[PDB]
Amino acid sequence: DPIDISIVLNKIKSQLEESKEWIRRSNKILDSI
Amino acid sequence: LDPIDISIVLNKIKSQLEESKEWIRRSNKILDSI
Amino acid sequence: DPIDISIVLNKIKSQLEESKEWIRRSNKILDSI
Amino acid sequence: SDIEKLKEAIRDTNKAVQSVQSSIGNLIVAIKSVQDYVNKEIVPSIAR
Amino acid sequence: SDIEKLKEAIRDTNKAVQSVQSSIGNLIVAIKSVQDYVNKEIVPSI
Amino acid sequence: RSDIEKLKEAIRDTNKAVQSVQSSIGNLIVAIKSVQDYVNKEIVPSI
Numbered sequence: 001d002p003i004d005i006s007i008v009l010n011k012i013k014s015q016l017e018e019s020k021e022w023i024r025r026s027n028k029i030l031d032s033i
Numbered sequence: 034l035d036p037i038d039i040s041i042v043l044n045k046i047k048s049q050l051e052e053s054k055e056w057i058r059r060s061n062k063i064l065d066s067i
Numbered sequence: 068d069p070i071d072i073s074i075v076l077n078k079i080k081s082q083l084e085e086s087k088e089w090i091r092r093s094n095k096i097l098d099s100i
Numbered sequence: 101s102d103i104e105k106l107k108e109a110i111r112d113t114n115k116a117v118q119s120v121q122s123s124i125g126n127l128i129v130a131i132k133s134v135q136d137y138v139n140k141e142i143v144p145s146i147a148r
Numbered sequence: 149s150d151i152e153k154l155k156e157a158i159r160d161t162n163k164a165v166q167s168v169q170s171s172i173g174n175l176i177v178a179i180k181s182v183q184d185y186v187n188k189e190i191v192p193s194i
Numbered sequence: 195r196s197d198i199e200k201l202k203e204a205i206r207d208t209n210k211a212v213q214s215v216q217s218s219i220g221n222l223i224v225a226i227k228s229v230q231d232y233v234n235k236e237i238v239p240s241i
Contacts, residue, residue: 002186002187002191003133003134003137003183003186003187003191005130005133005134005179005183006180006183008126008129008130008133009130009176009179009180011126012123012126012127012130012172012176013173013176015119015120015122015123015126016119016120016123016169016172016173018119019115019116019117019119019120019123019165019169020116020166020169022112022113022115022116022119023112023113023116023162023165023166023169025112026109026110026112026113026116026158026162027109027159027162029105029108029109029112030105030106030109030155030158030159030162032105033102033105033106033151033155034143034146034147034236034237034240036138036139036143037135037138037139037228037229037232039131039135039225039228039229042221042224042225042228043128043131043132043225045221046124046128046218046221046222046225047125047128049214049215049217049218049221050121050124050125050214050215050218052214053117053121053211053212053214053215053218054118054121054211056207056208056210056211056214057114057117057118057121057207057208057211059207060110060114060204060205060207060208060211061111061114061204063200063203063204063207064107064110064111064114064200064204066195066200067103067107067197067200067201069233069234069238070181070182070185070230070233070234071230072178072181072182072226072227072230075174075177075178075181076178076223076226076227078174079171079174079175079178079219079223080220080223082167082168082170082171082174083167083168083171083216083219083220085167086164086165086167086168086171086212086216087164087213087216089160089161089163089164089167090160090161090164090209090212090213090216092160093157093158093160093161093164093205093209094206094209096153096156096157096160097153097157097202097205097206097209099153100150100153100154100198100202102151103151103197103198103201106151106154106155106158106201107201107204109155109158110158110201110204110205110208113158113161113162113165113208114208114211116162116165117165117208117211117212117215120165120168120169120172120215121215123172124172124215124218124219124222127172127175127176127179127222128222130179131179131222131225131226131229134179134182134183134186134229135229137186138186138229138232138233138237142186142190142191142194142237142241143237145194146194146237146240146241150198151198154198154201154202154205157202157205158205161205161208161209161212164209164212165212168212168215168216168219171219172219175219175222175223175226178226179226182226182229182230182233185233186233190233190237190238190241193241194241
């Protein structure tokens, strides 16, 4: 009865999306210079 | 089958992950100094 | 018949080389300050 | 101020790295899980 | 100027992080492929 | 220790943090490859 890591994988993508938004904000600040 | 054993690699990743967290800790500490 | 994730792993190796190059460019700029 | 702008751009970059650091921690857990299953479920069933 | 150098250094760093972000996305795919193979080809067979 | 000097050293530390992450990802590749090879060379032949 099988391996179920789809949970933590679907978490990783969320923390990854969080990181991408942080780089978005950083570049937005550099845009204002 | 004597079993999977990637403990050495996984423990090295953790160590490097901690070194990474320490470098960010130092960067933020300096930013606080401004 | 076997797992073959070499396509994905080779991409990751390529992306790390690009990431390393970007850090080189950053450090080279900081060196000139 | 430009100095202040650079400061908070770096702080945002650092937050992005922190999120990456958390992702890597969970990747270790995902790979460890696949290992543990192979060792605790697949290997014994073959041995049976 | 020093301010312009710092701005470009951070932009280079941000690109390095973006490359790492892409690598992590692909690491998920690699792990998923091993899970899928185990779940859909080994487990049924055993 | 001027503000410019502080910002530089802050970025230098951030870059070292990214390099450590890069190192960790390279070892994550090794770890996943190890699981693949073990499944291919030990599990599949038996099963």
